[PDB]
Amino acid sequence: MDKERLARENHSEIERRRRNKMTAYITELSDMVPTKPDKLTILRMAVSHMKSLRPSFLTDQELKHLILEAADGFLFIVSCETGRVVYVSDSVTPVLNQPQSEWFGSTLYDQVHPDDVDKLREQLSTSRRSFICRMRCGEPHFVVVHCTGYIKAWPPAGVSLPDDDPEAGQGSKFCLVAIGRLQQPTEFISRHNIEGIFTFVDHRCVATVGYQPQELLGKNIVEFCHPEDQQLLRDSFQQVVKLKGQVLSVMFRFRSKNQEWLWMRTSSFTFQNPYSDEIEYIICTNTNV
Amino acid sequence: SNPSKRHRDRLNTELDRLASLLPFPQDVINKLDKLSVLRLSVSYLRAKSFFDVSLKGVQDNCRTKFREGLNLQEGEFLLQALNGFVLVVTTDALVFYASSTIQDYLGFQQSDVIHQSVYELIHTEDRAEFQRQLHFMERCFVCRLRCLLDNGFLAMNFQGRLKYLHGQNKKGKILPPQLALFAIATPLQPPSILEIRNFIFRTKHKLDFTPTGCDAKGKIVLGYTEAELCMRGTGYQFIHAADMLYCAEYHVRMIKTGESGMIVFRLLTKDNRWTWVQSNARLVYKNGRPDYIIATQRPLTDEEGKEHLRKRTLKLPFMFATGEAVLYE
DNA sequence: GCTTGTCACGCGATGCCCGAT
DNA sequence: CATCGGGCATCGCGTGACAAG
Ligand SMILES: CC(C)c1c(O)cc(/C=C/c2ccccc2)cc1O
């Protein structure tokens, strides 16, 4: 219709529903404070209640509460210089079943799996960090932990460092402030050293064995193989080296991530260095049966 | 002098008193409108009422004053370690809360998002999935939210739970609490290295392609230093499995003619990432017989690496395989 | 030079309060 | 014990000033 009137009536409706939102908010405030009154009474009671309740919208522990309710985890602040545990929150008890007694006075290297101790180093050398390791907990018990965090300049602003504090003589230059949290018939290809260690894992593994590629790399394939099928799979891996370029097929059952046994046919052959004719790796095509 | 003018003056002075009490910096308070003032005070009241039910540091056997100072900001430390932001949303798709870091990731200031419908931030193609997530109770999903930094969207992983939002005092002509999503939203993560910088780099290898030298830019791109670069096997230990046969063919071509020809493949970096390269392998001779290889690579992007892969000349097994790798000494 | 939105304002229709019936 | 008219306060409506984008 007419230009000016279309604009005018839509402005009418905009102001009308502005007043509607206002009234709705005021009745929300009426629902939200201790104690039918008109809108001015509601506003005065609300400002009195807000003055009784009282810069950030939430207090520090409310923010922490929201975070930990959402996705668990525990905060740890270590130093990159030695991995020394500068700080660890209380939530490490519900996460690792460990007291704060165990992490203070220690380093992060003492709290993770030994074979991870070097991966840790690569994450602490010299913004964001995101890795996974195995942390401790009547014999030793490790659990997978996904850590994510950042590198911060030490000491933090606003936190006083007294003279007699144990941190006074530390003098770290950088810190990892992170949070750590717990936790189909196809085929996939893989590469192995002549000892049998996964060194390349096809992404189709999740569709065939359910594991993520990271869950397979670095481990020997026999580790996932039924204790009986192990000597046969080993003989296959050793004879595939003697017969370079030849195909060796072998059937064996593979423990899925759901800890089921899946029968698989693995066909292996060597990779020949085109100059030296030396074995670079073993190519396997692991197929479900 | 005017009746209704003085009535609305009373309304406005109470609105001013309400705005003065909001837990925001005064530079944020001054640029607030009255509607947002009421909305934010409602949000603050609902938050404090829920915390009065749900909530309440260093165990007193480890107590140092620096540790106590750190504990008093433990919350902000966790917030900075999120690499993302907290989102609490109600069954009515109302943003019960969003952390300040949302401004760092989407450009929306926290002041403008609370007590507003979360769908205003979410792609129309993903609001259905989000609402399906809003209604056995842990949650893990993906969603694309509005990105004002791009000015433009951002795909984010949401990890969270549904917990009863107490203290909301809902009614009907008194209601029980309903499930609100408490979640952390983080960006998505890619797996391949692309150089932003032309960054041509040469490396020397033995006749079996075992690396022996590498220039500066090569270090900048692949992440290894010289020693660790040579002590990891030959060159085939770094090559993506979907490319090893093509590089082997071009290696035999170089063995038989001296020149590789322009080949395209992927190489494993120190952080176990794949980087695309267009490379060329030439043989230097000593006394008329091959001595070593000088392979020069140009860093490529995935958009052109995949284009080279789809216009592949030869086709060989594992050509389209995708996967991760490792490398030891 | 247009769009969207905030704020104030004029204006009556009821609302509350309360001497006076 | 109400009922009833005063005058001011609430309250919702539409429009104009003005400004950020
Ligand atoms: C040292 C390592 C990362 C490396 C390199 O710096 C170049 C090549 C390139 C090899 C090649 C093969 C065929 C044709 C042309 C080049 C392979 C590597 O592992």
PDB file of N, CA, C and O in Angstrom, chain B residues 264-295:
ATOM      1  N   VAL B 264      52.716 -34.154  -7.081  1.00  0.00           N
ATOM      2  CA  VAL B 264      51.974 -33.558  -5.973  1.00  0.00           C
ATOM      3  C   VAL B 264      51.633 -34.652  -4.971  1.00  0.00           C
ATOM      4  O   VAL B 264      51.113 -35.705  -5.353  1.00  0.00           O
ATOM      5  N   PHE B 265      51.908 -34.400  -3.692  1.00  0.00           N
ATOM      6  CA  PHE B 265      51.639 -35.398  -2.657  1.00  0.00           C
ATOM      7  C   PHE B 265      51.574 -34.706  -1.296  1.00  0.00           C
ATOM      8  O   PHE B 265      51.545 -33.476  -1.206  1.00  0.00           O
ATOM      9  N   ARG B 266      51.531 -35.506  -0.230  1.00  0.00           N
ATOM     10  CA  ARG B 266      51.393 -35.010   1.133  1.00  0.00           C
ATOM     11  C   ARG B 266      52.550 -35.508   1.988  1.00  0.00           C
ATOM     12  O   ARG B 266      53.014 -36.639   1.824  1.00  0.00           O
ATOM     13  N   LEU B 267      53.004 -34.664   2.910  1.00  0.00           N
ATOM     14  CA  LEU B 267      54.102 -34.998   3.807  1.00  0.00           C
ATOM     15  C   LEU B 267      53.687 -34.805   5.258  1.00  0.00           C
ATOM     16  O   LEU B 267      52.961 -33.867   5.601  1.00  0.00           O
ATOM     17  N   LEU B 268      54.182 -35.704   6.106  1.00  0.00           N
ATOM     18  CA  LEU B 268      53.874 -35.701   7.530  1.00  0.00           C
ATOM     19  C   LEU B 268      54.783 -34.717   8.254  1.00  0.00           C
ATOM     20  O   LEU B 268      56.011 -34.849   8.209  1.00  0.00           O
ATOM     21  N   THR B 269      54.181 -33.744   8.935  1.00  0.00           N
ATOM     22  CA  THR B 269      54.930 -32.765   9.705  1.00  0.00           C
ATOM     23  C   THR B 269      55.290 -33.329  11.079  1.00  0.00           C
ATOM     24  O   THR B 269      54.944 -34.460  11.432  1.00  0.00           O
ATOM     25  N   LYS B 270      55.997 -32.520  11.869  1.00  0.00           N
ATOM     26  CA  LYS B 270      56.435 -32.960  13.190  1.00  0.00           C
ATOM     27  C   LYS B 270      55.250 -33.188  14.122  1.00  0.00           C
ATOM     28  O   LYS B 270      55.261 -34.117  14.939  1.00  0.00           O
ATOM     29  N   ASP B 271      54.218 -32.353  14.015  1.00  0.00           N
ATOM     30  CA  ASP B 271      53.003 -32.522  14.800  1.00  0.00           C
ATOM     31  C   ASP B 271      52.033 -33.522  14.181  1.00  0.00           C
ATOM     32  O   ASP B 271      50.834 -33.463  14.481  1.00  0.00           O
ATOM     33  N   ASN B 272      52.525 -34.422  13.326  1.00  0.00           N
ATOM     34  CA  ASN B 272      51.710 -35.480  12.723  1.00  0.00           C
ATOM     35  C   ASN B 272      50.547 -34.906  11.913  1.00  0.00           C
ATOM     36  O   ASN B 272      49.429 -35.423  11.944  1.00  0.00           O
ATOM     37  N   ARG B 273      50.814 -33.828  11.182  1.00  0.00           N
ATOM     38  CA  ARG B 273      49.850 -33.238  10.269  1.00  0.00           C
ATOM     39  C   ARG B 273      50.312 -33.444   8.829  1.00  0.00           C
ATOM     40  O   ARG B 273      51.509 -33.591   8.561  1.00  0.00           O
ATOM     41  N   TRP B 274      49.355 -33.466   7.905  1.00  0.00           N
ATOM     42  CA  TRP B 274      49.641 -33.637   6.486  1.00  0.00           C
ATOM     43  C   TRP B 274      49.698 -32.278   5.804  1.00  0.00           C
ATOM     44  O   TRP B 274      48.766 -31.480   5.932  1.00  0.00           O
ATOM     45  N   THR B 275      50.777 -32.019   5.074  1.00  0.00           N
ATOM     46  CA  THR B 275      50.888 -30.804   4.281  1.00  0.00           C
ATOM     47  C   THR B 275      51.078 -31.168   2.814  1.00  0.00           C
ATOM     48  O   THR B 275      51.850 -32.073   2.483  1.00  0.00           O
ATOM     49  N   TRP B 276      50.353 -30.475   1.941  1.00  0.00           N
ATOM     50  CA  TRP B 276      50.467 -30.707   0.508  1.00  0.00           C
ATOM     51  C   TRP B 276      51.746 -30.077  -0.032  1.00  0.00           C
ATOM     52  O   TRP B 276      52.166 -29.009   0.421  1.00  0.00           O
ATOM     53  N   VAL B 277      52.364 -30.742  -1.005  1.00  0.00           N
ATOM     54  CA  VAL B 277      53.542 -30.219  -1.687  1.00  0.00           C
ATOM     55  C   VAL B 277      53.492 -30.600  -3.162  1.00  0.00           C
ATOM     56  O   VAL B 277      53.101 -31.718  -3.520  1.00  0.00           O
ATOM     57  N   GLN B 278      53.886 -29.659  -4.014  1.00  0.00           N
ATOM     58  CA  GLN B 278      54.284 -29.946  -5.385  1.00  0.00           C
ATOM     59  C   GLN B 278      55.805 -29.936  -5.429  1.00  0.00           C
ATOM     60  O   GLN B 278      56.435 -28.923  -5.105  1.00  0.00           O
ATOM     61  N   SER B 279      56.383 -31.060  -5.825  1.00  0.00           N
ATOM     62  CA  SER B 279      57.798 -31.327  -5.667  1.00  0.00           C
ATOM     63  C   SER B 279      58.392 -31.814  -6.980  1.00  0.00           C
ATOM     64  O   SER B 279      57.685 -32.198  -7.923  1.00  0.00           O
ATOM     65  N   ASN B 280      59.723 -31.811  -6.995  1.00  0.00           N
ATOM     66  CA  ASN B 280      60.541 -32.134  -8.152  1.00  0.00           C
ATOM     67  C   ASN B 280      61.872 -32.648  -7.630  1.00  0.00           C
ATOM     68  O   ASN B 280      62.511 -31.983  -6.809  1.00  0.00           O
ATOM     69  N   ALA B 281      62.283 -33.825  -8.089  1.00  0.00           N
ATOM     70  CA  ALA B 281      63.490 -34.476  -7.595  1.00  0.00           C
ATOM     71  C   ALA B 281      64.510 -34.575  -8.720  1.00  0.00           C
ATOM     72  O   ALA B 281      64.248 -35.213  -9.745  1.00  0.00           O
ATOM     73  N   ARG B 282      65.668 -33.946  -8.526  1.00  0.00           N
ATOM     74  CA  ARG B 282      66.758 -33.958  -9.492  1.00  0.00           C
ATOM     75  C   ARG B 282      67.981 -34.634  -8.888  1.00  0.00           C
ATOM     76  O   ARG B 282      68.248 -34.519  -7.687  1.00  0.00           O
ATOM     77  N   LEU B 283      68.730 -35.331  -9.735  1.00  0.00           N
ATOM     78  CA  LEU B 283      69.916 -36.065  -9.315  1.00  0.00           C
ATOM     79  C   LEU B 283      71.162 -35.245  -9.623  1.00  0.00           C
ATOM     80  O   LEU B 283      71.362 -34.813 -10.763  1.00  0.00           O
ATOM     81  N   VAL B 284      71.983 -35.028  -8.618  1.00  0.00           N
ATOM     82  CA  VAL B 284      73.323 -34.494  -8.822  1.00  0.00           C
ATOM     83  C   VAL B 284      74.245 -35.677  -9.071  1.00  0.00           C
ATOM     84  O   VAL B 284      74.034 -36.775  -8.547  1.00  0.00           O
ATOM     85  N   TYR B 285      75.259 -35.476  -9.901  1.00  0.00           N
ATOM     86  CA  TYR B 285      76.189 -36.541 -10.229  1.00  0.00           C
ATOM     87  C   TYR B 285      77.577 -36.210  -9.700  1.00  0.00           C
ATOM     88  O   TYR B 285      77.958 -35.040  -9.575  1.00  0.00           O
ATOM     89  N   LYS B 286      78.311 -37.265  -9.358  1.00  0.00           N
ATOM     90  CA  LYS B 286      79.726 -37.204  -9.024  1.00  0.00           C
ATOM     91  C   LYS B 286      80.455 -38.197  -9.916  1.00  0.00           C
ATOM     92  O   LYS B 286      80.059 -39.365 -10.002  1.00  0.00           O
ATOM     93  N   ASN B 287      81.499 -37.725 -10.597  1.00  0.00           N
ATOM     94  CA  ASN B 287      82.255 -38.552 -11.539  1.00  0.00           C
ATOM     95  C   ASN B 287      81.330 -39.285 -12.505  1.00  0.00           C
ATOM     96  O   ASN B 287      81.594 -40.423 -12.899  1.00  0.00           O
ATOM     97  N   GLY B 288      80.224 -38.640 -12.877  1.00  0.00           N
ATOM     98  CA  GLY B 288      79.317 -39.186 -13.863  1.00  0.00           C
ATOM     99  C   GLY B 288      78.326 -40.204 -13.353  1.00  0.00           C
ATOM    100  O   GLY B 288      77.616 -40.811 -14.164  1.00  0.00           O
ATOM    101  N   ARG B 289      78.250 -40.415 -12.045  1.00  0.00           N
ATOM    102  CA  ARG B 289      77.316 -41.370 -11.473  1.00  0.00           C
ATOM    103  C   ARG B 289      76.508 -40.703 -10.371  1.00  0.00           C
ATOM    104  O   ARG B 289      76.998 -39.785  -9.711  1.00  0.00           O
ATOM    105  N   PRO B 290      75.266 -41.139 -10.155  1.00  0.00           N
ATOM    106  CA  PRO B 290      74.393 -40.425  -9.216  1.00  0.00           C
ATOM    107  C   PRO B 290      75.004 -40.356  -7.826  1.00  0.00           C
ATOM    108  O   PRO B 290      75.651 -41.299  -7.364  1.00  0.00           O
ATOM    109  N   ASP B 291      74.798 -39.220  -7.164  1.00  0.00           N
ATOM    110  CA  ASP B 291      75.361 -38.953  -5.849  1.00  0.00           C
ATOM    111  C   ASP B 291      74.289 -38.665  -4.812  1.00  0.00           C
ATOM    112  O   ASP B 291      74.272 -39.304  -3.753  1.00  0.00           O
ATOM    113  N   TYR B 292      73.386 -37.728  -5.087  1.00  0.00           N
ATOM    114  CA  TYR B 292      72.324 -37.402  -4.145  1.00  0.00           C
ATOM    115  C   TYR B 292      71.181 -36.732  -4.895  1.00  0.00           C
ATOM    116  O   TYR B 292      71.287 -36.417  -6.082  1.00  0.00           O
ATOM    117  N   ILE B 293      70.085 -36.516  -4.175  1.00  0.00           N
ATOM    118  CA  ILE B 293      68.873 -35.916  -4.717  1.00  0.00           C
ATOM    119  C   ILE B 293      68.689 -34.541  -4.094  1.00  0.00           C
ATOM    120  O   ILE B 293      68.935 -34.354  -2.898  1.00  0.00           O
ATOM    121  N   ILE B 294      68.251 -33.581  -4.901  1.00  0.00           N
ATOM    122  CA  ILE B 294      67.872 -32.257  -4.421  1.00  0.00           C
ATOM    123  C   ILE B 294      66.403 -32.073  -4.772  1.00  0.00           C
ATOM    124  O   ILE B 294      66.059 -31.770  -5.922  1.00  0.00           O
ATOM    125  N   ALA B 295      65.527 -32.254  -3.789  1.00  0.00           N
ATOM    126  CA  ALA B 295      64.094 -32.149  -4.008  1.00  0.00           C
ATOM    127  C   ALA B 295      63.613 -30.790  -3.512  1.00  0.00           C
ATOM    128  O   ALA B 295      63.825 -30.438  -2.347  1.00  0.00           O
TER     129      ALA B 295
END
